[PDB]
Design a protein around this ligand. Structure first.
Ligand code: HDD
Ligand code: HDD
Lengths: 726, 726
């Protein structure tokens, strides 16, 4: 026995806040969180306690410390099959990572509609509010490898596998409502331009390099998604606080065969929230697993990620009613024109047991649809349907990837397909072909119908010549970027400016920066001028004179495009650093933690060393991390309670803690003598909005703090931060 | 016709300093650099200028912007083979990364021995000082994925492929002289313990988590290499400024049949230099590609990485003359007892053309030896021999990985092996077996001999029973960690204490921190008490009385174990930040640059925006990066010239640049009114060692600054940094 006497090696199997317990495989953490998919995985879950260590062939190992050798200082013998099996498995552990979205973090959960959608779709999983569909959701970045950092500036993926009674439906979306390019044929070109450059494989997790900006400068269709990426959309605070979108127009098909154009949305019930660039970038170094950690910890704490599924619905007769093409995936559908109808809720409530087996091996593919859904001619979606099947043949080693446990349907699957590498299913059917008489033609085709019917494509009319040609209706590149720009708040606009400015400064060939600045002048002159000024570029007369693109169907903005214009901040699951001293006023701390608890806000108690400190009244306070070990980057606000403030007053790390949080626009609260830290961040005696201060941490001081936290960041502080050396 | 008219898209094909030009593929950057291996790759190099865009079957493509569809808004057609070939290739770009050492950066070079070593080895590549051997060297971290960050704390790999006239020899070493474990059977245990934990795949690039320290606390044999990893050896400044070691005892075999034991060494001719922890961590965020970029840029500049091959040589009859077992890979051979004999020089002087083709596909394996070398019974080496062949079968797709161009021998290779996936060689031999008469038994066996002879193993005596048993002579864990500790300077000991303290503070289960502290108590009490204090742990009276381990063969220390005890700095290839203002005194700048050029030191000119500023006298100064864009982390020293200081005096970023460099112990030089910045880093009027100051940059402001850079960092500043909030 190697475990400690007191059992402190094993985390409690009950929900606990971030950092109170060691994290654990989801079935050991939350053994009674069940869904039909989790239950069906029980046939392959393997335990460990009380079992003998064995080879893979079931032979018990006596000595797992030593190779077999001739003499105890002799050569290793070829007949050591225990060593070789163990080393062979190790030698072959890795499989190819995903071509794109290789970095991702996943969890199990469930979906339930708010109401029957049978009027617009025959999809069985939307037929009844009491129908619960298990899901497995993987969130991801796009550019970086599986080992890259989470808080990069990038698009994020948001892929949901629905295990429905009528097939797996995979909704494979991103956190912006469009993509960079129009036609799938260009996907390898765009992806090669953004990925590490081929001679030296730099940079990882970054669009901030010559080839990306070269491609963008030569392909103005990219400008819309580039605006999204350069805004704070590209740096979410958490996968829980970002939107999701299918990107493409798909179709719903009802029992009568009527088709309705649909775009899919996921609305985060924790609201929208993003980092600021300096904080995100520094966070890639301080914790490159920050989002992966934050997701896994939210679920272990019972702060389940929740999203509302939304449909923007457009009748078939309305295909041509907008001044952009519905099938152009570089164009969004403003919610002011077509509202998002809220259709159901998805809740992510259990982490995987084994990351490699369930997350790394999961296969999501937008061609995985079910009766009641169909495709459109969107030329980016069309070519996707080829790729997500093809790519699995090397990534997951052959065509039986659907037999990998996480990928298996929970509903029946039977057909005449046979063999392939690592074939699991042993078919007993005398027939492997149809039509057959020898098994009475089973399994049999099923006619399309209102429920449990076979899949039939919507009989869309196709008229034209075989051509490699972009639709003329796709040839407008500037008006959606502008609509997005005009819908941002002024501080969101300034961060977009800073995102282009920072990125372009890392482009080595100056003519690329100039060409990009030209494209910005086609979108908005104020934007183009602001970025030009940060690059030392002067706009020419021609450029000052470029007529702005037209409004989108008469819209001069749509506030649903902003992260922050319409407040939807939720503090549950956020985190505050509390900076301790060696004699904390226990009364400040009691009230603080009580008020945070009431709102579901977590706390990490921080000090200049590990172990514990003792409060004025003798309460022993355990330390979660040092100031340097858990930087302000990792929290949403900072409180400094009263006590022996002299203990920390001269600590560089504790002062810097506050400077960093201040620079990144986080709320700061200072009680009693903690107000002496106002000097480090240059706050006037009379105080400032976003700095909470009081003689003690009374009820009012906490309400003020928690109000600021609901608004996420103190945007009004931005003009004070450039004087601050941090 | 998309290139700019002025040709500025194309990097100058001649040596230029970091940042002056875009980087490029080696064969375009340095077309005149050659060696035998680079010449032999010529048949697979593919050009591009003036060629048509084609399919892989050579069919010219007319439209590479669109898929083939029925009507320009219609569905994509299955008959578009140009689209499917291009997506198919993209879909299968990725191959499995290396189980360990997945993150690495590589270059071509050559090796030449100083003199014939024929008296001690018949290895052809060591036989003649005129004999030049091409090499390809890949440096790496160990734990993180291929997309993880460079400046992590980790062991580093240093692998060299020698393309000799008698076979490929791979010398597959690391940057410390030992390993964590004794027997290869445990390799998957240790590697699993250090790698991201299996439920959630966290943390990347870091040993700072519970499973690593649980294994260490249960396996004291690990403590030697842990000491190294926790010292500044764990965070080198550059692959150019670290040592390399083969780790194991191997044999040399001369023409007479005499065996001599040998341990391999690489000495960096640029000297030994490491980062400090806070700087290394933050740098994984600001530039996760910093070592890869630095290596590529040094070679493009002509600062070729150079290393001296050295041997520690022990006669067979001295096998048992030490306090430790020569075969135990957790033990080092102190240079005090067995000096390193210099053998030859290696220069890395060309970057690859394609990172994937040459770096990612390169296969190094220490079983690749040549006649004149042989193995020993080291039980970690012994097991390695199995792994590096086996692992290539999945990583590189089959047994023909030696035909991938980078892996090919430059010397003849002929045998009776056939077939296998992606077989390139087309064999014309009528025979595929021997003995044969039908091809007169060719290719033929060759007897061993003084040169050009067949491989024969040295006839070592083996005697004992078939056992899975550790040699008792390996059962001593603490003496080498202690010898390591006592050989370090007091500031190096401080950094070791801080590395244990930081990592252990991230271990969630406290009993594990306590168990590790109990292990440090067996090594050295001062070390153990200093880590304990940082962790709030108190040593027991029993722990305080642990007798220290014996010295190693009479040694109370060995200064060759310290990075810094014996100065060996070299400033060539280092970089200085120069913080500009809008009216720079140009006499200061001429003097600065002239002095830096004279020592081969680079400079990057930084401002608050990109573009240019104009000096007092109309000299236009191009700006390389912004203060935020190229942080102090990325440079070795900072110089602030005189001019309009009021321009930058209240710029937060400019002040913080100096505070960050100050904290990280970098030399800082201030001229004239730039002395105003002394207030931000809290320097007294009369000055301090490590801050160079004067009315103007002369003559001997530059000699002082450069003397400080030669010493690398200002260690004496350490007591001052805790105060500073940065
Ligand atoms: C034809 C090329 C192509 C096209 C144009 C796109 N994708 Fe894709 N995508 C792939 C080809 C691909 C892929 C190579 O097939 C991936 C990588 C590995 C895999 O399993 O699928 C993938 C992965 C992938 C993932 C990760 C799924 C996972 O977590 O495993 C997401 C979320 C998206 N894609 C989303 C999108 C969106 C929203 C797109 C446009 C609206 C888009 N992709 C266009
Ligand atoms: C028995 C397993 C085993 C053991 C005990 C070791 N290695 Fe290893 N090593 C492997 C099994 C392995 C490997 C799985 O075979 C790798 C990864 C994939 C590859 O091509 O080789 C590898 C890669 C690898 C690399 C990277 C090569 C490259 O750049 O591609 C280096 C530098 C080392 N190792 C160095 C060492 C050192 C100095 C060791 C002890 C002194 C050591 N390894 C012990």
């Amino acid at each position: 026995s190697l475990a400690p006497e007191d059992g402190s090696h094993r985390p409690a199997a009950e929900p606990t806040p971030p950092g109170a317990q060691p994290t654990a495989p989801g079935s050991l953490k939350a053994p009674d969180t069940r869904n039909e998919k989790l239950n069906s995985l029980e046939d392959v879950r393997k335990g460990s306690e009380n079992y003998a260590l064995t080879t893979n062939q079931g032979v018990r190992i006596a000595d797992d410390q030593n190779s077999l050798r001739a003499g105890s200082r002799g050569p290793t013998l070829l007949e050591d099959f225990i060593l070789r099996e163990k080393i062979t498995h190790f030698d072959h552990e890795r499989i190819p990572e995903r071509i794109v979205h290789a970095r991702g973090s996943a969890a199990h959960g469930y979906f339930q509609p708010y109401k029957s959608l049978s009027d617009i779709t025959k999809a069985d999983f939307l037929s009844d509010p009491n129908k619960i569909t298990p899901v497995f959701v993987r969130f991801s970045t796009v550019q970086g490898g599986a080992g890259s950092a989470d808080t990069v500036r990038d698009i994020r993926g948001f892929a949901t596998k629905f295990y429905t009674e009528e097939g797996i439906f995979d909704l494979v979306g991103n956190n912006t409502p469009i993509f960079f390019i129009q036609d799938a044929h260009k996907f390898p070109d765009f992806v090669h331009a953004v990925k590490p450059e081929p001679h030296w494989a730099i940079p990882q997790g970054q669009s901030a390099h010559d080839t990306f900006w070269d491609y963008v400068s030569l392909q103005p269709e990219t400008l819309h998604n580039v605006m999204w990426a350069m805004s704070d959309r590209g740096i979410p605070r958490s996968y829980r606080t970002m939107e999701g979108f299918g990107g493409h127009t798909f179709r719903l098909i009802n029992a009568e065969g009527k088709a309705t154009f649909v775009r899919f949305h996921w609305k985060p019930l924790a609201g929208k929230a993003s980092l600021v660039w300096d904080e995100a970038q520094k966070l890639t170094g301080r914790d490159p697993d920050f989002h992966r950690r934050e997701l896994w910890e939210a679920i272990e704490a019972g702060d389940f990620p929740e999203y509302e599924l939304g449909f923007q619905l457009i009748p078939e007769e309305d295909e041509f009613k907008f001044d952009f093409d519905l099938l152009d995936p570089t164009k969004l559908i403003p919610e002011e024109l077509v509202p998002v109808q809220r259709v159901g809720k998805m809740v992510l409530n259990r982490n995987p047991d084994n990351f490699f087996a369930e997350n790394e091996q999961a296969a999501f593919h937008p061609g995985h649809i079910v009766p009641g859904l169909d495709f459109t001619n969107d030329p980016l979606l069309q070519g996707r349907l080829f790729s997500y099947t093809d790519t699995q043949i090397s990534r997951l080693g052959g065509p039986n990837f659907h037999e990998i446990p996480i990928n298996r349907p929970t509903c029946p699957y039977h057909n005449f397909q046979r063999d392939g590498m690592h074939r699991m299913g042993i078919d007993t059917n005398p027939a492997n072909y149809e039509p057959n008489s020898i098994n009475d033609n089973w399994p049999r085709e099923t006619p399309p119908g209102p429920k449990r019917g076979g899949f039939e494509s919507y009989q869309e009319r196709v008229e034209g010549n075989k051509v490699r040609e972009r639709s003329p209706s796709f040839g407008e590149y500037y008006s959606h970027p502008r609509l997005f720009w005009l819908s941002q708040t002024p501080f969101e606009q300034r961060h977009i400016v800073d995102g282009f400015s920072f990125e372009l400064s890392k482009v080595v060939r100056p003519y690329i920066r100039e060409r990009v600045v030209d494209q910005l002048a086609h979108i908005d002159l104020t934007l183009a001028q602001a970025v030009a000024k940060n690059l030392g570029i002067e706009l020419t007369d021609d450029q000052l004179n470029i007529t702005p693109p037209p409004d989108v169907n008469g819209l001069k903005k749509d506030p649903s495009l902003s992260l922050y214009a319409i407040p939807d901040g939720d503090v549950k699951g956020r985190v505050v650093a509390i900076l301790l001293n060696d004699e904390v006023r226990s009364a400040d701390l009691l009230a603080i933690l009580k008020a945070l608890k009431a709102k579901g806000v977590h706390a990490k108690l921080l000090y200049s060393r590990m172990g514990e400190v003792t409060a004025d009244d003798g309460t022993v306070l355990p330390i979660a991390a040092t100031f340097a070990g858990a930087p302000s980057l990792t929290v949403d606000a900072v409180i400094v309670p009263c006590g022996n403030i002299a203990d920390i007053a001269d600590n560089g790390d504790a002062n810097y803690y506050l400077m960093e949080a201040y620079k990144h626009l986080k709320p700061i609260a200072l009680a009693g003598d903690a107000r002496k830290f106002k000097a480090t961040i240059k706050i006037a005696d009379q105080g400032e909005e976003g700095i909470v201060e009081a003689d003690s941490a009374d009820g009012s001081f906490m309400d003020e703090l928690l109000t600021l936290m609901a608004a996420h960041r103190v945007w009004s502080r931005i003009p004070k931060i450039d004087k601050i050396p941090a």
